[PDB]
């Protein structure tokens, strides 16, 4: 049984921010994901360009696990075809996605007193992210025409702000954890395989 | 490039066994399917099952679960169909088709046709 | 076993032309729908895969577009050698299904 990696991904001890995702790539492996959906510890899991039951009978080249930490009322934003600050400047899924969408409860590991501010995300940025786009650059935000020179100002902005995660903010401004789970299908060998159905 | 060349046309006596080969060239052997598919004359294709070259795993449907075993030899590139107790309704056309593993199949042999014939 | 539905059963149309033909499907297979070309004698060729991917030496005449349970083939123009069997196949988990074919002959 070599089956695929997942635990890794979901029960890392820390998680991305959602500017600077993180992204696995998984292959050469068996993967049971029915016993990943029908868990009610995990809050979302929405798959689009497949059904829940055959993901077992597919077989797939390679799988990317992508992984960050958003708030509560922003993984609507996850889906295909959404916009918002995050699909628009953090993480953006193409309008084909084929994959999974996991997300959960992180208030317990993800707040601190005072609210953790590690966990960060773009508020700003001059274009919206092409699908699968990562930018972790710090360059201070022009809005207006004049020249920002490296330097924080009026109109002159730094373009990644912070979660509050406070242990009681509350239901929606609370720490989620997220799994993207894409599934690449090109012309090559497959190498990540449903269980086999014997069974 | 790649090629599947498969055996020639068989006469078989009814309920009896025969032993179709495909040898394949072109393609690394153990990391595709090889898939067999079934046509009769007038109908449209019928897929009977895939294997695995490398582990040697074989899939079929119900239908063809006890008619039809699958063999894989990566020292010749050859894989195998078996089929038993042969009557008229197993004369056909057997195709053997590479699989990448997502069911469409790109590589075609050229056929075997199964006479089942007194 | 999903099921499969393809029409026209038959067709005919001249050189030059524009044909389309289509599949149905029992269940939503989403986009793992492929095309095959068949002739006398000979095996299936396929055309399409994964519902809109043209495979390697298909011309570019042949174009697949459709999903969930309805699926289309077309080729913008007719060309003499396009004379065959079409068949339609879901790639959606075993087993694997063919349609029962749409026979193109070419008007003169």
């Known amino acids: 049984t070599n089956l695929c990696p997942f635990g890794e991904v979901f029960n890392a001890t820390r998680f991305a921010s959602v500017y600077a995702w993180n992204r696995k790539r998984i292959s050469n492996c068996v993967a049971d994901y029915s016993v990943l959906y029908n868990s009610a510890s995990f809050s979302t899991f929405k798959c689009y360009g497949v059904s829940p039951t055959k993901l077992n009978d597919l077989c797939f080249t390679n799988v990317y696990a992508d992984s960050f930490v958003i708030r509560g009322d922003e993984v609507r934003q996850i889906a295909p075809g959404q916009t918002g600050k995050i699909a628009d400047y953090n993480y953006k899924l193409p309008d084909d996605f084929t994959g999974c969408v996991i997300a959960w409860n992180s208030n317990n590991l993800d707040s601190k007193v005072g609210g953790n501010y590690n966990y960060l995300y773009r508020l700003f940025r001059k274009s919206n992210l092409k699908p699968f786009e990562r930018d972790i650059s710090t360059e201070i935000y022009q809005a207006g025409s004049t020249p920002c020179n490296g330097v924080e100002g009026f109109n002159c902005y730094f373009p990644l702000q912070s979660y509050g995660f406070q242990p009681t903010n509350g239901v929606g401004y609370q720490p989620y954890r997220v799994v993207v789970l894409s599934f690449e299908l090109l012309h090559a060998p497959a190498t990540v395989c449903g269980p086999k159905k014997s069974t | 490039q790649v090629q599947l060349q498969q055996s020639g046309p068989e006469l078989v006596k009814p309920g009896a066994s025969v032993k179709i080969s495909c040898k394949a060239s072109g393609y690394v052997f153990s990391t595709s399917w090889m898939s067999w598919v079934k046509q009769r004359p007038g109908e449209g294709p019928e897929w009977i099952g895939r294997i695995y070259p490398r582990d040697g795993h074989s899939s079929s449907t119900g239908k063809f679960k006890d008619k039809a075993t699958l063999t894989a030899d990566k020292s010749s590139n050859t894989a195998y169909i078996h089929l038993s107790s042969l009557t008229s309704e197993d004369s056909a056309v057997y195709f053997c088709?590479?699989?990448?593993?997502?069911?469409?199949?790109?590589?075609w042999g050229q056929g075997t046709t199964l006479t089942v014939s007194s | 076993d999903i099921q499969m539905t393809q029409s026209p059963a038959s067709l005919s149309a001249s050189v030059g032309e524009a044909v389309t033909i289509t599949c149905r499907l029992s269940?939503?297979?989403?986009?793992?729908l492929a095309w095959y070309q068949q002739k006398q004698g000979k095996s299936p060729q396929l055309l399409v895969y994964?519902?809109?991917t043209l495979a390697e030496g298909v011309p570019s005449r042949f174009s697949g577009s459709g999903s969930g349970t309805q699926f289309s083939l077309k080729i913008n123009s007719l060309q003499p050698e396009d004379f065959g069997t079409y068949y339609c196949q879901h790639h959606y988990g075993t087993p694997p299904t063919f349609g029962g074919g749409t026979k193109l002959e070419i008007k003169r």
């Open positions: 088709a590479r699989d990448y593993g997502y069911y469409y199949f790109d590589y």
């Open positions: 994964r519902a809109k």
């Open positions: 269940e939503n297979v989403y986009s793992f």
